Amino acid sequence: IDPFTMKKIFMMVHELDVNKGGMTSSMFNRSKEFYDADIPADIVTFDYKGNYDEIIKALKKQGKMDRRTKMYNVFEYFKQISNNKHFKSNKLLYKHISERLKNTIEIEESKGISRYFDITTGTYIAYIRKSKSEKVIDFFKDNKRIERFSFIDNKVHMKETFNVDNKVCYQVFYDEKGYPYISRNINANNGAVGKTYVLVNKKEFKNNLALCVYYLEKLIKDSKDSIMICDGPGSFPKMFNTNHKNAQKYGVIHVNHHENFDDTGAFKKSEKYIIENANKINGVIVLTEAQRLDILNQFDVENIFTISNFVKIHNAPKHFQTEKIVGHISRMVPTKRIDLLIEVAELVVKKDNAVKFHIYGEGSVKDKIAKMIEDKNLERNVFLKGYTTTPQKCLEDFKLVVSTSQYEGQGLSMIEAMISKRPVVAFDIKYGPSDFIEDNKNGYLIENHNINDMADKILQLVNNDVLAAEFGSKARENIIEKYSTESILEKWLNLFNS
Amino acid sequence: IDPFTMKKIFMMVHELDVNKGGMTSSMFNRSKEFYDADIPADIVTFDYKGNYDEIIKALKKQGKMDRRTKMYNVFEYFKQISNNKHFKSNKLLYKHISERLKNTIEIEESKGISRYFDITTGTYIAYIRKSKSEKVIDFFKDNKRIERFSFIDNKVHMKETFNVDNKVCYQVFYDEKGYPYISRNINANNGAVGKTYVLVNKKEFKNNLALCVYYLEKLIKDSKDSIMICDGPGSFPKMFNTNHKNAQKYGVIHVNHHENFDDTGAFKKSEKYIIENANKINGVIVLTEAQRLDILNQFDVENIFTISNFVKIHNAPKHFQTEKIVGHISRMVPTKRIDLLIEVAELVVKKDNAVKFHIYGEGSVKDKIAKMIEDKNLERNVFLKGYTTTPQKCLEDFKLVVSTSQYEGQGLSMIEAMISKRPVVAFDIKYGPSDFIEDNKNGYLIENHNINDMADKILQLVNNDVLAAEFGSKARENIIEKYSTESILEKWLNLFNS
Amino acid sequence: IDPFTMKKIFMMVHELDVNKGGMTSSMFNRSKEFYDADIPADIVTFDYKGNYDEIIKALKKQGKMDRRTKMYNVFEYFKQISNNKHFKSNKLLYKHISERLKNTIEIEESKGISRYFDITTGTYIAYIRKSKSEKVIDFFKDNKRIERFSFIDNKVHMKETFNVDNKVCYQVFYDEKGYPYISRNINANNGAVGKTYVLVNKKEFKNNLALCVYYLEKLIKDSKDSIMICDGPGSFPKMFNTNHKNAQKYGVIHVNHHENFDDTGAFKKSEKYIIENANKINGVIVLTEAQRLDILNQFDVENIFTISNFVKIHNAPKHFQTEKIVGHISRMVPTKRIDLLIEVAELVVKKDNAVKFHIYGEGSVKDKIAKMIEDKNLERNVFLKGYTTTPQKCLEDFKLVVSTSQYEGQGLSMIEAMISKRPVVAFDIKYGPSDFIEDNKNGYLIENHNINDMADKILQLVNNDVLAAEFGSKARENIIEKYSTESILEKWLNLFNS
Numbered sequence A, B, C: 001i002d003p004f005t006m007k008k009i010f011m012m013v014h015e016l017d018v019n020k021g022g023m024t025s026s027m028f029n030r031s032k033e034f035y036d037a038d039i040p041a042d043i044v045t046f047d048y049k050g051n052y053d054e055i056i057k058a059l060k061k062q063g064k065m066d067r068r069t070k071m072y073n074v075f076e077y078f079k080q081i082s083n084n085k086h087f088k089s090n091k092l093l094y095k096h097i098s099e100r101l102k103n104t105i106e107i108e109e110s111k112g113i114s115r116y117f118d119i120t121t122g123t124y125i126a127y128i129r130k131s132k133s134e135k136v137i138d139f140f141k142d143n144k145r146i147e148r149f150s151f152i153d154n155k156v157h158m159k160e161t162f163n164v165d166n167k168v169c170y171q172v173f174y175d176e177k178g179y180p181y182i183s184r185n186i187n188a189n190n191g192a193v194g195k196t197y198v199l200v201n202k203k204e205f206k207n208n209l210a211l212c213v214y215y216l217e218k219l220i221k222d223s224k225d226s227i228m229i230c231d232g233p234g235s236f237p238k239m240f241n242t243n244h245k246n247a248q249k250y251g252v253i254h255v256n257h258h259e260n261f262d263d264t265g266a267f268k269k270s271e272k273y274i275i276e277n278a279n280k281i282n283g284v285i286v287l288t289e290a291q292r293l294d295i296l297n298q299f300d301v302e303n304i305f306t307i308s309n310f311v312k313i314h315n316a317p318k319h320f321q322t323e324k325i326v327g328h329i330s331r332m333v334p335t336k337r338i339d340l341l342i343e344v345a346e347l348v349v350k351k352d353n354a355v356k357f358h359i360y361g362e363g364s365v366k367d368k369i370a371k372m373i374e375d376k377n378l379e380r381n382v383f384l385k386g387y388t389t390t391p392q393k394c395l396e397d398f399k400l401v402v403s404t405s406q407y408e409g410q411g412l413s414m415i416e417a418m419i420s421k422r423p424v425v426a427f428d429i430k431y432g433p434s435d436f437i438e439d440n441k442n443g444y445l446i447e448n449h450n451i452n453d454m455a456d457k458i459l460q461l462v463n464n465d466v467l468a469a470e471f472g473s474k475a476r477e478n479i480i481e482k483y484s485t486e487s488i489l490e491k492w493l494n495l496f497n498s
Helices: A023-036 A052-061 A074-083 A091-101 A208-219 A233-240 A269-276 A289-298 A338-351 A367-375 A412-419 A451-461 A465-482 A485-496 B023-036 B052-061 B074-083 B091-101 B208-219 B233-240 B269-276 B289-298 B338-351 B367-375 B412-419 B451-461 B465-482 B485-496 C023-036 C052-061 C074-083 C091-101 C208-219 C233-240 C269-276 C289-298 C338-351 C367-375 C412-419 C451-461 C465-482 C485-496
Strands: A008-012 A041-045 A071-073 A104-110 A113-118 A124-131 A134-141 A144-152 A155-162 A168-174 A180-186 A193-198 A203-205 A226-230 A248-253 A283-286 A304-306 A325-329 A356-360 A382-386 A400-403 A424-427 A443-446 B008-012 B041-045 B071-073 B104-110 B113-118 B124-131 B134-141 B144-152 B155-162 B168-174 B180-186 B193-198 B203-205 B226-230 B248-253 B283-286 B304-306 B325-329 B356-360 B382-386 B400-403 B424-427 B443-446 C008-012 C041-045 C071-073 C104-110 C113-118 C124-131 C134-141 C144-152 C155-162 C168-174 C180-186 C193-198 C203-205 C226-230 C248-253 C283-286 C304-306 C325-329 C356-360 C382-386 C400-403 C424-427 C443-446
Touching (some): A008 A233, A023 A485, A074 A180, A091 A155, A203 B104, A233 A269, A248 A485, A283 A289, A289 A304, A304 A485, A338 A367, A338 A382, A412 A465, B008 B233, B023 B041, B071 B074, B074 B180, B193 B208, B203 B208, B248 B485, B289 B304, B304 B485, B400 B451, B443 B451, C008 C233, C193 C208, C233 C269, C248 C485, C338 C356, C338 C367, C338 C451, C412 C424, C451 C465
Parallel strands (some): A008 A041, A041 A071, A325 A356, A325 A400, B008 B226, B248 B283, B356 B382, C325 C356, C424 C443
Antiparallel strands (some): A180 A193, B104 B113, B124 B134, B134 B144, B144 B155, B155 B168, B168 B180, C124 C134
16 A cells, blocks of 8 residues: 555544444444554544534543544534635624623622623523533523523634524624634424524525535535445434545444344334445445355345444453453443343342352443342442443453343454453354354354353353463464454455555 | 595505515505595505515516505605614624624535535534525524525615524514614514514513504694594504594404304304404494394494495406306305305206316315325316416306305405406305396306206306396496496595594 | 510511401400510511501501501511612613513503504514502413513512412512512422522522511511411411520410311311320310310310400490391301301291391302202391491491301300300311300300201290390400400410410
């Protein structure tokens, strides 16, 4: 690959945030590898945040995002156009705000929260809340909130309008000199973005889709060296609909495409739309051959390719754990079936008592598990430890780990554990686990409903230190041979070259 | 009749419009005949239209309204009072509008539709739509429409106010120099007019009824030579409630007074109110003796008189049609039972295929007929040709015509067809057809449910050219002897003279 | 008692009003007796009225309130603080109002009611209603009322804000120079007072409870000579929650504490809260030993004391009535079971016809009694005479009187009648009647469901003039011996001294 290649990759997803994992981790690391191979791979997002600067800076400070990865955001782009049209700050905006606050007395609620009342009439005028570098000002009309101005570092970046139910129905974004550059309608019911007005260019759009199609045609040169990769399934139409004639388009599916918990044969509606149009773009990528194989029968398309996530080999713990500890790391999600896990930890501890179960995670499964834990009185064995910033020093504490998930794209959490020499006991589900857990040499695969069979193989190893240690080391080394950076990279480059 | 008579007739109805037929046609022609006999007969209306000038001009251009017939409208009257109180245009109104639009940028939607956004705050200010000589300006508040200004020739004539559901709850009417002369409350639910404020006279009224009672006492001199004729049943209370001591009052009923599709013996509520008060005014007029007869038993009143509509004899077609074509002209209305018609055209064409059925009309029966047409697969026989501006050159194309109506006042469409020498096959219903279709000499009457008996007599004549031609000529000439202008006029004059 | 004692009693209740009886009568007279014994006893209220001055003046003019009794009201207090901070009238408030009314025409509705419309646009601006010394101005926005300014003697005292449903959601109170001193949120659904802003002191409160707790700590010196008596059960938390360490606190229960019409054993929720905290204050007072006795078992507290209302002996009528008249005085309330009364007056008059039944009262039982009266056709015997300002000259007209009440605190109306030498026939209910009607010496007690037994003893006396006269005189004198001022007063003083 030409160190001076003019190839560039644009990887698309709705938003980035701190403490948001999932495919964005896969995007971050994938960007890192492309740059290492001298192909810049940046990220494109389509949502509004007044503090994206702080968010990206923090993602890089925490080592989650490679320093070379840029994020291109649609509102930032028009903000930058607006910044270069005015050469004088919008004082009138501040005057407008200041005028509405004159003739008021202040009544404090607490140190950064006060209300303001007209001193002639006693009418409720404003609510002001201040925290650190942020400030919100809420204006009232007939004692109902109508507007909120949001500030960062004493500069307005956003104004919101509220309807009779006190929900947002309109937004304005201001540039760094105080000028409005975009406004847009919000449907108060569901929060869907509607008509979008690009004020700085005197142009209207039907909605954010139309806005971003336009943005991408400005952002991404129409050359065969421009590569677009859409990871966010919700964002695929933005890519699909541009008028690029020469730039390449790929869509990546990160999850099982079958609808969750269905016997109809139902496919998730977005991922089905992406798959069905595979022959209208350069390619749809899935993480396993298993999934690629299922698709080629099910659908009449051919442009389906298998490319695994890159895998990064962190250093293993210095010490094998031997205390009968076994943990679970995950978001608290229905599809990871932690409900079965507690019903196996129930089983393990009726038979062997000194085993305990450490659970890290946050989500819609936590407080109906906590209640599930002591309904059957098990919280001196089963522990629910909340969120994990450092889920590698949690791996060191574990002898083995468990996965009761029914639906995965690849199961990276299971791979990541094997890297720390911590062997895995998990369901034989699609897709992922069947590949990198070799039954009886680095961890166990069970067939997916037999939580009883899970009892045996789990407490087997929680009292066999040497088979615990040897399998984890066979689990780490297996990963290294199976998922090499150079192998993945090559599959990418063959697609781009055509 | 004195060519210098001071008699004048005021004929009342809610509104006039282009493409609105029915009794207004009867009013138009009736006015024409009264003027010919040297008695002016003008029309009074009670609704608001900013473009009534254009509407009346067009009605006269199209030859629907006699050039001598004036329309007196209640809002026009107060508009004219306001016009003579101010001698300087209302610049402040335009300044008010212009002020709210300053400091905006424009964002086009299409060539005559743009939106306006405050350039300091980005707030949505206005929507402007322009077409030819008309313009509407919509102002927004918290991103919801609150007001609409309507323009004709760049002059405001109306302002409307909108509630939270974006429905009108208040209206203002402006005179030709821009001054508000009337405002009024609207009930957003049903559109009923409420409190009405006559600003130019500093006076309030309970509602449009009270307003128009007042108007009529100003418009119509209280002399025995002032004659009021109420045609619009909805407008009867306006007439009934004035304090005129000397002016004559008549009400005309144009329809069957029995409630439609009823077995109770139910009378339409308005027409019952008019009938019950017949002995409290000079007279209630119905179009047939049949109907007059039914009333005199049913009710304890005597002032019921029969006077037919005037009938105008247009020139007949030069040629008899002989192609097996037979048509239906009507609004698409439940009471004209076109449902039976298609179920007779079904019958005719199972027996004789080369017959086809041309249907002109628009209404609430059209798209459940179109579907009814091909559910039984008949659209190469039965044709639905939309609206008719020239329903006489449609008469020429026909050999005969059909009426499946169950409820009529007289059945003028059936008479009008006979004039074009096109004989009629229609139900023997009340009221009208029993009079001017002589069974077996100019057309057929069937008894009203036997659509099978209709099959026989219809396709009889669609293949008997000479009985088709002779009956139509017997149908035209019959009309001429039966309904003469001089005969009708005389019945009117005897009422007025008493 | 020291004529120079620094003892003072503060008696608490939500509001005072004219034509509002009940415990406020008991408070009025109780105040009178304390002052006579040289201990000032004033009243504290917690609601807003712009005309409290007129109301108190009228209560004293009518001899209902002792001239020495002051009323301390929470809003008056802050009004007075505001009055002493400004030394210039708030002209801007009047300018604000005047500005919104300029450029309008007036349209009269009647002599004190007019509407105002902008003369440039015709928009509805205001509604003004004037009566005597009061005026309200309503302002409109998009033809919906948003604000009402209330005036007394041409000075604003209140401004109200209206929501989309035209209900109050915010109030402002202005001082006598026109300055806003308090504003507060109203929940439009139920009318509950919320966040309260004491503008004159730049301070906020959670609600009226928090406001009044604060008020009472300012109003009532924290000394053992400050005595707080809470009569209004709704107002007990205001007293209970102050931080007074030294001032005494008593709560008085005026009614049966059992929930009305219940078989569960349910206690009225407020009175239960007061009773349960009896040992946390100086004492809970009930009107009878009977009720005190029921409580000491039912609850685990001891600070329950019995002290009767003071009783005032008005002069008796000069003449015994002997016409068979027998009356009922009461508010028309479910708990006084006038339904049974009419079903005894039914019984009395089937047997003796010349007896009639005079009923004075107003309430939620009147119009389902009127209908109940002639459904059984009895209004030439049973009479419903409306409200009574002079219920002593109604006592003179009566030979005896009746009470069918199931629930009482003491039954003062029954006592008051005996004073006029009018003996009572009433149910033996709790609490009260068992004490001061001695069965067979001054009136009759029946057991509470036997309305038939009531027939006998009633018409017995309506035809025994001498037993009617003698029992009433035994009824008057009994009261005098039983309920002496000095006896009551002494029970109070022993509590205060401890």
